[PDB]
Amino acid sequence: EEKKRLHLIIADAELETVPPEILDHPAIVNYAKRRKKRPEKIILDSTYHHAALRQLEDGERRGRPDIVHICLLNALDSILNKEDRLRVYVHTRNDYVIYIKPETRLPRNYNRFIGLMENLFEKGAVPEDLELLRMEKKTLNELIEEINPDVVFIMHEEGELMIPKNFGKLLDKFKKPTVIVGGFPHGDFKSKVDGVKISLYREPLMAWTIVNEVIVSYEWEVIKKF
Amino acid sequence: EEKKRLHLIIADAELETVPPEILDHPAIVNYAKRRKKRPEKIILDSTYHHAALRQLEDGERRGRPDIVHICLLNALDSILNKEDRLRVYVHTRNDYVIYIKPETRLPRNYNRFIGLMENLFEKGAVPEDLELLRMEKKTLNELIEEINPDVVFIMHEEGELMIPKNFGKLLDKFKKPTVIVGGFPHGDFKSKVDGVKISLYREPLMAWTIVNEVIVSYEWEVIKKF
Ligand SMILES: O=S([O-])[O-]
Numbered sequence: 324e325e326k327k328r329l330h331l332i333i334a335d336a337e338l339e340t341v342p343p344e345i346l347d348h349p350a351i352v353n354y355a356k357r358r359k360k361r362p363e364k365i366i367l368d369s370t371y372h373h374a375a376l377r378q379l380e381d382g383e384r385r386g387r388p389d390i391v392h393i394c395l396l397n398a399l400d401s402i403l404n405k406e407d408r409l410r411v412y413v414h415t416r417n418d419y420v421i422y423i424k425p426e427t428r429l430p431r432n433y434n435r436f437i438g439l440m441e442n443l444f445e446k447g448a449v450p451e452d453l454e455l456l457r458m459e460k461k462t463l464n465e466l467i468e469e470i471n472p473d474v475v476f477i478m479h480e481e482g483e484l485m486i487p488k489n490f491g492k493l494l495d496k497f498k499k500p501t502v503i504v505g506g507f508p509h510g511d512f513k514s515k516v517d518g519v520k521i522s523l524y525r526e527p528l529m530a531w532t533i534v535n536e537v538i539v540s541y542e543w544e545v546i547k548k549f
Numbered sequence: 550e551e552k553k554r555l556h557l558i559i560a561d562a563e564l565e566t567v568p569p570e571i572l573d574h575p576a577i578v579n580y581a582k583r584r585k586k587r588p589e590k591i592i593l594d595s596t597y598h599h600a601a602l603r604q605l606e607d608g609e610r611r612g613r614p615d616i617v618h619i620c621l622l623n624a625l626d627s628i629l630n631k632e633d634r635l636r637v638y639v640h641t642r643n644d645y646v647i648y649i650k651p652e653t654r655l656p657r658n659y660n661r662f663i664g665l666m667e668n669l670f671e672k673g674a675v676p677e678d679l680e681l682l683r684m685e686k687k688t689l690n691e692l693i694e695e696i697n698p699d700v701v702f703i704m705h706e707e708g709e710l711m712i713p714k715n716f717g718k719l720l721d722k723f724k725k726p727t728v729i730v731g732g733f734p735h736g737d738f739k740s741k742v743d744g745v746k747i748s749l750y751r752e753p754l755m756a757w758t759i760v761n762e763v764i765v766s767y768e769w770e771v772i773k774k775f
């Protein structure tokens with residue numbers, strides 16, 4: 324744990340269980356009933372729960388765990404991860420952090436991945452001995468503190484523009500660079516932290532695109548074989 | 550349509566509706582019943598339909614449309630696509646091809662994406678005027694013929710090894726390079742076609758990883774701005 328790795332935080336993620344406010348909205352009960360599960364245990368998924376988000380704060384961007392799924396399948400199956408050059412983290416829109424042991428194989432199927440998330444929030448670490456996934460109350464600065472990185476990059480549409488190629492060459496110049504990708508469909512970050520704001524393109528991109536640009540550009544810089 | 554683009558075929562994809570053989574397996578009926586849908590219209594998804602695949606040929610690798618979903622979200626939201634430098638295609642394990650108009654926004658949520666696939670197989674092109682997705686009976690060579698490419702690359706674990714960086718520099722040396730990524734969890738290709746066999750890493754990678762390596766490496770070569 325002295326080699327150059329990328330610490331990659333999927334921040335302000337729209338990954339949460341059903342909000343208390345709407346546990347008794349019809350759509351939440353009818354869904355909870357069909358799925359034979361206590362509503363407060365269920366992961367909020369706008370695709371099913373839209374009719375219950377109409378009146379909720381930030382309701383239109385919330386309950387998009389899909390974004391996380393695709394970002395993790397991207398990160399964890401990366402060559403970069405296979406070479407032991409990536410720690411990936413998830414910080415949620417409710418200031419919970421998820422630590423992810425590199426060797427973790429996420430479910431390829433979305434609905435198994437959701438099943439896993441429901442577990443993780445219930446038990447707090449899964450599975451029981453291994454704790455490949457572990458979750459606890461934590462702000463993003465508290466998390467950044469733990470990492471103790473020598474640079475922080477905030478992937479943001481309004482940042483200093485870079486060719487992806489070049490960002491990679493930049494990340495290689497540090498020992499423990501953190502990069503923060505928003506885990507949310509649209510809008511600005513909620514957590515404001517210190518960090519360098521970087522745009523990799525002009526028009527806005529989705530989290531996973533950002534993830535894949537960032538990881539590959541480092542890969543060809545940090546992986547010596549390349 | 551004279552500029553350098555990458556023609557990217559997701560081949561031999563485990564995307565099909567329920568096979569005729571198992572339309573009357575309990576698990577298929579109970580699922581079809583709950584989802585109030587005629588079994589033969591449903592997209593085969595092993596995560597739900599495993600108990601019905603035990604005795605089916607190739608049953609253990611079949612019904613993984615997830616792999617396609619993640620590969621398309623990767624491809625279509627790529628910068629490469631935004632710059633009009635990518636045609637993406639899907640050829641299935643049942644010799645059907647899906648043409649995908651670049652501007653297409655795939656559902657981010659897996660289960661909406663499945664809904665769309667059920668549609669596409671039913672109506673044959675969706676939506677009705679736009680036909681952003683269009684599907685017809687077609688082998689892979691028949692498809693490769695239509696493309697009329699000046700080189701064919703087959704992403705394969707047992708191929709000539711390349712640094713991804715370098716493959717990109719290679720793809721740029723052609724006008725209309727096709728690259729073929731297997732749309733299946735494991736095993737060898739079913740369709741055998743002419744093409745150069747390329748491995749980007751040693752240990753095996755998932756389709757999307759391959760897709761993301763391939764697209765980004767071309768991006769930094771073909772996109773002049775980069
Ligand atoms: O990872 S499992 O969902 O195929």
Ligand SMILES: O=S([O-])[O-]
Nearest residue numbers: 655656657658661
């Ligand atoms: O693309 S829709 O499923 O969010």
